[PDB]
């Protein structure tokens, strides 16, 4: 489930009129058309941060797994954080990060190597040339992993009690017995085939890692979100090389190639093109942000129900009689293991 | 109301020069002057304006006296002490009620402070004033508005400024205005209670984007920061051969319009000052370019079409016109980018007994396509006769432009020469006389590489330009690399520094301190730009060494990094939050604590069961 | 806003310009105000969709939290939901979720089952818990120890397959009478 | 005429609406009126 | 409960410039304004 999108903070002044005073004066004649755009994108960014907060920040106390790890037979090393890794992330959580490629990290401070780009500069340098920047998320993808680790260590050491109040420790065999009792099967079944069910759980966990290793793309939803964002940004940059029926598409060209009395006609055309192009980007970003907010509210509800307890609604927390759920952090989203 | 204005205002906490008296320096005048004085009764009468203050240019004079004012516009000669000795060509006399008001409560301690503001926008001399009975002793800061008195259109040139004195048997407060954006707080009764600048302090720039005099706790995005370039490099090609415009303006037989001679001007330096000396022009109508802005452009090729035509036909020649010449003789294309030149020549297309050398075409089977010659002598058909001869219904196509020294101007030989440019993306073979300055790399500079104007940072590259390659670009079609015309080397181009400034402030009712966040830019770059004073931000927030913090979201100036962990208060970005905390108070940035560090006591057989309970009532909106 | 016109007042440019020429400026004003009223309408549509999502959420929250008890965790407030009381607010609704939250807990002991005589005994509804010396059955969300009887537990097993099974004696109210 | 819908041409300021007395505190140099969204509000009577 | 809407694939080229070459040439000067529209409508159809 996608949880957030790329946070953009476009500037009308530089995007429409790159370092130009005459064009800025002409744009001032359109009223507060671009204060609206800046406000809308600021609201979108704040809403994405709130979406991440809703989805992951569900536990106040950050829990930790016990120093030893023997949960009655259930093998959780595949989703618990790995101390050896510097990033402290799960093995299944690394594949999601290695299978999604972000065009712009945002937290790069890339300025200083557009000169050092040597070859033809890329999308990011090209966007920076026309005032088109991307903000970084408030929550790093290193403490989102900490939120996920706390959530997963609270559901395997305390059951669902940590989702209501104080985290009450409960052995994992008895937690499984309770989850079984919650779907209409008596507890004795689990205690009579605990070894078999532990083997089944371990096999199921083991065969979900290869299913993401070898598949072309199962994260195609998150990659679709990222591609839509980068492609909207690209189709918004590419509108700055369009004449819009003007003499030339370069402000620094038509400014030095015409006197101010006549250059106003062409600058007006370029402004009325770039404003209508930046109002398409803002509108599609608002619509996509509403869609992403719906998906993130769905993800937050799914976390609060599937993860912090047992859900009696059929086909909500996976197919079958739901028992438990594990969250995993993915680029701009979350992954549930039902 | 919280109305926001952009006009000439005296900057807040600016420099005002305080004088004394006991000779009378002539202060410069520009963008207006703010004047203030604190006096007992009267020692200052009025002011003098104008340029060079002599009997060669007009000037102003606004001396007050006991009852009236004496405003005028004139060309006074001098006084060197009756304040003038000349009123020769002098009019625009004006008289009204006096500007000076003085009142005393039976005592001289009421040293009323008189404040004045003058400006000369589009003439229309504006004067503002306000007499505050203060306590002018120390020029207080208590806000004080200014009411206009008179607005009179002198419409002159003012650069210098002076003042008059009085007699007898600590004043002169002068400040200079600047174009600034102000946010003014209006009282219910219509006065102005408070005003805040919008280019002074980070808090001020925020208080004037939330158009409010109170900024609630949080982080607010105000503007962006750019590094204005230090130097301007213009790198034109390695050619010094002056163009043959001489031999296109020094010719003797500018052909007739039916055969428009077309020369080609390439591999040359085009200084159009030689275009401006061989011809006392009558029509310099340029369409694609401004004639003033012609020495700073580079053209791939230049065509000089020369032909002598009659007077009305000069007005005829233009993009998208009509007539016997614009249709059958010479048709300028609609999207023309160039200039037309027409000057009078009845000394070379004239003689006694007359001349009829020139020619033109009134008879063509169709219109002439743009830039097409049609030299041919075919008799125009009439009726249905294939006739080959002259006479009725059988007409020769081209008739004469017989030129003689005596017709009206509407019928005289103007030697029309039109210049056609190709201002597109291609190697430039013709450029203006602009000199080729040196090259500086690793520094924000305005570049004019072979007519490609822009801004950015340049450096060495390892590109593999093919020998024919000249420009560079990227996947979104923005010019990336330019081959140096005089070094044949490859230089990449960077944005200036473009980013975004966000101001992190607590509530204004708590503190006036702020933190500044420059988005996604290394803080060494913003530090060197600040020390070079080349940053667009004119609000310079302090940098004490403990207020710099390279965040993954940019760098933070004005907040110190504490290594503790607290709940997030003001979200900055990338796991860093700022808050107003005691030391005795300052703004600190920290890494957000996700919650209490808790460890569960999971075991094989240990269980925690609640022996009690609580009932909590939460709220959801 | 002039939108690049002579003036921003229609009653001004109409009284200052003749109809043949004022059309150029009025067209500019129209194409500016129409594009300004199509931004307002579009953003109002987006905000209305968002408000509809929030109001559908509020209606579902009312129908579940108010008109019944919701077994969904963290939907009707934090904790085990008990009730919810609605309150009307300007352009919205306010919920007062009454929830049951546990309190002071103690480490006791637990075993998956109790093996009395060759047979594993499991709790009908609750946890086998131990003060430390005397095994007790109790609920899950509240401590209420009870004597382990044949009514509290159901019996099925062989006392060789349950891992962690503890040895204790269950009671029957039948042998005595 | 006040308290009646009338077309006004106050000193070249054309418009339509209803006029009446005010208790505004126009400074002597003040001539026009407006509000927070820049719409002409009150016009000082040129002959009263 | 509605489940889907009508799937449309409006084409800018014919909608804006019916079988016209000059009009298409002028429309090419507006950049990728209509590739965006086609992509949005295709996304809507796939989403339905
Ligand atoms: C839990 O599951 C782990 C799977 O990651 C097991 O780790 C394995 O370790 C062996 C080497 O001993 C590797 O060859 C194998 O690829 C895997 O990484 C781990 O042993 C297992 N532990 C228990 C108690 O079941
Ligand atoms: C706006 O102007 C009003 C008219 O003068 C002021 O009301 C007056 O207030 C004084 C006391 O200051 C009274 O004595 C007088 O009768 C009248 O009510 C009003 O205060 C003023 N508002 C301001 C200055 O904010
Ligand atoms: C247009 O007229 C120009 C000036 O007479 C010609 O330029 C010169 O022509 C002479 C020959 O008359 C050359 O010797 C000289 O090098 C220079 O080119 C130009 O040729 C002429 N063009 C046409 C198309 O007639
Ligand atoms: C469960 O928790 C209750 C409050 O959360 C306890 O009630 C308290 O009783 C004391 C008096 O003993 C009061 O002073 C206090 O205000 C509160 O009402 C209750 O005793 C407690 N029960 C157990 C068994 O711990
Ligand atoms: C086990 O649970 C018993 C509750 O029945 C507690 O035993 C009590 O002990 C007293 C005497 O000390 C008896 O009089 C009483 O009837 C009861 O049996 C006992 O405290 C508890 N064990 C622990 C370690 O808490
Ligand atoms: C619970 O009680 C059983 C009998 O009441 C024990 O079975 C015994 O097991 C021992 C070996 O451990 C045998 O030697 C003996 O004959 C009898 O079968 C059982 O072990 C005991 N379990 C625990 C955990 O105490
Ligand atoms: C005003 O001038 C003084 C004297 O040079 C200087 O110290 C002060 O900094 C100036 N004011 C400002 C705001 O720079
Ligand atoms: C002051 O100036 C006015 C200007 O007309 C003049 O009439 C008057 O005589 C002058 N002197 C005094 C004392 O008013
Ligand atoms: C006024 O200006 C004219 C301009 O030609 C000049 O001839 C004349 O001498 C001037 N009058 C003076 C200086 O009194
Ligand atoms: C005004 O005077 C200044 C200073 O001599 C000069 O540079 C400027 O060109 C003048 N302008 C006009 C319009 O006279
Ligand atoms: C033509 O050339 C001669 C060369 O001596 C020069 O004197 C004359 O001024 C030139 N005239 C024009 C119109 O170029
Ligand atoms: C530029 O011209 C100078 C002078 O002839 C020459 O020394 C230099 O090599 C030239 N450089 C290039 C790149 O043409
Ligand atoms: C940005 O970070 C630091 C601080 O300036 C320095 O290493 C250099 O300027 C940049 N480094 C990289 C890797 O971009
Ligand atoms: C305290 O902060 C400094 C930097 O300000 C950091 O180097 C150090 O590791 C911190 N100490 C602790 C215990 O966090
Ligand atoms: C739980 O049991 C396993 C295997 O019997 C053992 O390795 C582990 O140390 C035990 N842990 C506790 C807390 O009793
Ligand atoms: C249970 O005992 C462990 C061992 O010290 C302790 O850490 C934990 O807090 C205890 N839990 C309780 C008393 O609820
Ligand atoms: C308008 O003019 C008349 C005629 O002189 C005069 O009686 C009246 O007082 C004037 N009113 C104003 C407001 O000037």
Author numbering:
A (entry chain A): 727 to 1064
B (entry chain B): 47 to 68, 80 to 138, 158 to 210, 212 to 246, 263 to 482, 484 to 677, 689 to 726
C (entry chain B): 968 to 1144
D (entry chain C): 534 to 581
E (entry chain C): 727 to 774
Original authors' sentences:
The dense glycan shield consisting of 22–23 N-glycosylation sequons per protomer is an essential feature of SARS-CoV-2 S architecture. The glycans have been shown to play intrinsic and extrinsic roles in protein folding, modulating conformational activation and immune evasion. The transition to the ‘up’ state exposures of RBD for the binding to hACE2 is also a prerequisite for S-mediated viral fusion, directly correlating with infectivity. Here, we dissected the role of N354-linked glycosylation, acquired by BA.2.86 sub-lineages, as a RBD conformational control element in attenuating viral infectivity.
To explore the putative acquisition of glycosylation at N245 and N354 in more recent variants, we determined the asymmetric cryo-EM reconstructions of the BA.2.86 and JN. In contrast to S-trimers from most variants ranging from WT, D614G through Alpha, Delta, Omicron to XBB and XBB.1.5, which sample the RBD-up conformation more frequently (>50%), BA.2.86 and JN. S-trimers dominantly adopt a closed state with all three RBDs in the down configuration, similar to structural observations of VAS5, a highly attenuated SARS-CoV-2 vaccine candidate. Compared to other variants, there are two additional glycosylation related modifications at N245 and N354 in BA.2.86 sublineages, among which N245 glycan lies at outermost region of each NTD around the triangular vertices of the S-trimer. Notably, the N354 glycan resides in a cleft formed by the NTD and RBD from two neighboring subunits, and establishes hydrogen bonds with T167 of NTD and with E340 of RBD, respectively, acting like a ‘bolt’ to lock the S-trimer in an ‘RBD-down’ state.
